[PDB]
Each structure stands twice: as C-alpha cells, then as structure tokens.
Amino acid sequence: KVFGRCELAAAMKRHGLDNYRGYSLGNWVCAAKFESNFNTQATNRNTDGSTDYGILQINSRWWCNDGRTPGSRNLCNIPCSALLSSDITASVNCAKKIVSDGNGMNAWVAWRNRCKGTDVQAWIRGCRL
Ligand SMILES: [Br-]
Ligand SMILES: [Br-]
Ligand SMILES: [Br-]
Ligand SMILES: [Br-]
Ligand SMILES: [Br-]
Ligand SMILES: [Br-]
Ligand SMILES: [Br-]
Ligand code: NA
C-alpha cells in the first residue's frame, strides 16, 4: 500500500506515534517519505547482506528476522515480512523500540540527513487532525 501524506499522519497518530519520545508527528511523516516514499512494500538490500523493510525501512541486522542475515538479531521479535503489510501496526511498534534505544531518530539516516533541523511541520500542514 502507498499511503497519502495526511492518511499516514492520521494512521501514525492513531497508533500513538505523535510526540513519542518527544518527536512530533511531522518528524515521523518526513522520515517515512524519504525512507520509503510512503510505500509499505518497500525493501532495499544493504552491502553487508541485511535488508531494510517497510514504511520506515527497518533493518534485519538488528530488528526483524528474514532468515538470510547470518548473525543478526531479532529484537522486535517479528518476521520482517510483517513490516510490509498495509496495516502499519507492526512497523510502528518496532519503531517505538528503535527510537528508544538511545540515539533517537538518528537511527534513520535519511531522517538525520533530510529531516532533522528542517521545517518538519510542513509534512502535516493542512491535514485534518
Ligand atoms: Br508528499
Ligand atoms: Br537470519
Ligand atoms: Br535470497
Ligand atoms: Br534477539
Ligand atoms: Br494502518
Ligand atoms: Br532523543
Ligand atoms: Br510537526
Ligand atoms: Na535479524
């Protein structure tokens, strides 16, 4: 599924992501835009053999199990395929764990490079919330 901007904002807010760990809704939408372009089915392979999955591009090296990342962890205790569903519940719960591990949203390199320090409120402007 490819979300619209305000559609994804409302779904993130319903799942408790707005202001989670101090990060306003616009930060999460911005990060979803540049990680996946709002597409739940997005996947990308990394050079070390791990793969990133879903709306927020969660890495198999640490967070989910895809059965082809030797030596990796499964800290969200989830199959990586669960992060590709049209329902964002699994991706949101895992992101909550990732953002709480000490480095904030700097875990998402596209957030640090393309969202951090910008006018992130523009990503929820004009949405009915
Ligand atoms: Br957009
Ligand atoms: Br594995
Ligand atoms: Br393969
Ligand atoms: Br683990
Ligand atoms: Br949803
Ligand atoms: Br933080
Ligand atoms: Br915001
Ligand atoms: Na893994």
UniProtKB/Swiss-Prot annotation:
The active site is at E35, D52. Residues 1-129 form the C-type lysozyme domain. It is an enzyme of class 3 (hydrolase). It holds the Pfam family Lys. Keywords: Allergen, Antimicrobial, Bacteriolytic enzyme, Disulfide bond, Glycosidase, Hydrolase, Secreted, Signal. This is Lysozyme C. Monomer. In the egg white and polymorphonuclear leukocytes. It comes from Gallus gallus (Chicken). The lineage of its organism: Eukaryota, Metazoa, Chordata, Craniata, Vertebrata. GO terms for cellular component: cytoplasm; endoplasmic reticulum; extracellular space.
